[PDB]
Design a protein around this ligand. Sequence first.
Ligand code: GO1
Ligand code: GO1
Ligand code: ZN
Ligand code: ZN
Ligand code: ZN
Ligand code: ZN
Lengths: 360, 360
Amino acid sequence: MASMERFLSVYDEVQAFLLDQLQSKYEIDPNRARYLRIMMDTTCLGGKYFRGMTVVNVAEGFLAVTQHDEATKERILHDACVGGWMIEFLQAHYLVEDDIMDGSVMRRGKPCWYRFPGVTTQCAINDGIILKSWTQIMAWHYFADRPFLKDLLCLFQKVDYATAVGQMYDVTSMCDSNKLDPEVAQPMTTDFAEFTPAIYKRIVKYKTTFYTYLLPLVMGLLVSEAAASVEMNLVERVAHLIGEYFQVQDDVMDCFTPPEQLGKVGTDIEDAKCSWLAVTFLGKANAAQVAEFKANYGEKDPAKVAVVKRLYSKANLQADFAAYEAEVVREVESLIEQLKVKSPTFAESVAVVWEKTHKR
Amino acid sequence: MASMERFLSVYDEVQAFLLDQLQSKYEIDPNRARYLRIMMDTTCLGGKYFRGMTVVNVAEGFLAVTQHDEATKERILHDACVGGWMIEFLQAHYLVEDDIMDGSVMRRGKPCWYRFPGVTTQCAINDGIILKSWTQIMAWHYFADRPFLKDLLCLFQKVDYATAVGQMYDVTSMCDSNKLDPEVAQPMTTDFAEFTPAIYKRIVKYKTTFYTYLLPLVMGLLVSEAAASVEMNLVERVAHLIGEYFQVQDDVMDCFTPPEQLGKVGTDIEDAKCSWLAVTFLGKANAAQVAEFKANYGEKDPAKVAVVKRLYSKANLQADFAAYEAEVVREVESLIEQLKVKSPTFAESVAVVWEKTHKR
Ligand SMILES: O=C(O)Cc1c(C(=O)O)[nH]c2c(Cl)cc(Cl)cc12
Ligand SMILES: O=C(O)Cc1c(C(=O)O)[nH]c2c(Cl)cc(Cl)cc12
Ligand SMILES: [Zn+2]
Ligand SMILES: [Zn+2]
Ligand SMILES: [Zn+2]
Ligand SMILES: [Zn+2]
């Protein structure tokens, strides 16, 4: 059976299980079950399923080199799909909540969930809560007797916590750290002293890389009972390297990909985000360019946004991206080589993950 | 050592552990650690600690009748305090998110967390996420080697899910179920056919009783390794009975307790909530009283709110509350008697929980 089709069939199974349990154990009525079914479909489906499919791909890699009964191969693939959906539902939770936190308008070419007429923020915050609760219901039901259940739940909660910490790093990245104070309304920075490569790397590591690359790779190893087969420090290093590149691509797309292709009107400039473009620009700008950036960044005014986009184009940030990309290709290839010492199979899944990221 | 003082000392220990881990493993800077320390204090402290202290009280009950080394008694009490704080932090998560969902103004005589000038909804949604993530960090750290870890995490995630389902039942209680639809803005009911005792009991059971009574009682049994000592079906029945009474008290207080004592301006009438007062009023009103209720309920207009409060006073709902209370006293005493068959100690903790609820 083809990987994507198995993955999508498992979504139907998981959905039916969750909705049937709400009826038999939670006293749900048919109308609220329908609302939750539509919420699950709208928030969980329509993406590329890159995170979920990475778990499946890692597990398939090991099945090709490990001896198992057919029933065991089916069980491992079904566990990889359920684990992959845990990650997709975790992402769905953070997209719902982040779109509300940021006042976003569109997501995946459609309105953000909270903007649906019959949803509203009052419901959407709780719907996002339910999405993450469903990841735990899935784990306890499908993996009840599995030897990896403890390790999987412990890893999943560390990654979820790291992600929430990353969201805090992201939403506060335009403020001066010494001025953070719940009692005082937060002004935007004027000096941009905290727009540095090291601070940018911390935001990205926590807000994206743990759940987008580390969790799918390690979940694939856990469902395969193959973690003792790899060097965990190399898995962490390669995940944080590919994840950073993935976020740099997203930051560039936010500013330069047309809204039809991107599926939204990007507002990182208006939001004064500590993006790869702003940090890189400040890393090469002269005094006049820095001054013009400070006078225009973080403002809703489209003329001020146009000035910032022009500064980025005039600063030839394409050259910096090509240099960054060449360095990442180099380091990712080095880590893949080190991963071959203990597992050529796992190093190959990492090469596939990299190729899919680099070529998207 | 006195129960409350041990419980509060453990808060300091848990706080220091969480903040120190953010520094050593999550690359946090001192300013963001301070923001999170103030967020934890503001959202977790200041209440009565009824839920957390129930875990401690149940564990103390068993220590009085069970043989243990002194070091074991200290370990069980410390585990009961950590488990009690898991529940208090879970409540802190739901209060932060519910205040944002409901547009609430005050909580515990102070502004709701999202209303603090340096917080905002953008941060507060994520702060509420972190509060629940901290419950899992606490469990995995303090209970890593405990025999009850699996049962405790499985119970905690079922209770959290039941609570989020309850929040959905609550926020949609003023809509007609057949009209629920993410695509269509939801009108308030005109017939109030879903304001019935059975529907009210479902909202309350899920939104309050699992986390306020069931979870503290069962967590006290788990940390004491005493679950096989009680009949779980009686624990569930007594928890859902006391929890319902607790919510009925809160619904009456929302409408009639002055804002200074309540710590907020109650708005259940304006919000068209399916409260004990509305269901009970509709259960005894004549046609004219029903018609006047329909013309005034669920409106911000203070004159319309005053009409509803007058209808409640004229309908002599105090008599219905006294009859409900007499019936609860009767059923709670019956369940306490049944609990004595297997454990006089546990039945006594249930009597204390009831006395604290009934006399508050
Ligand atoms: O390659 C693109 O996505 C398009 C693109 C444009 C542009 O469209 O003018 N400008 C860019 C700059 Cl300044 C930096 C980087 Cl890294 C990419 C681009
Ligand atoms: O006992 C109170 O909390 C006060 C109170 C008042 C009132 O203050 O007029 N009115 C009530 C009604 Cl209609 C029903 C119930 Cl059960 C209680 C009250
Ligand atoms: Zn965001
Ligand atoms: Zn972006
Ligand atoms: Zn609410
Ligand atoms: Zn209330």
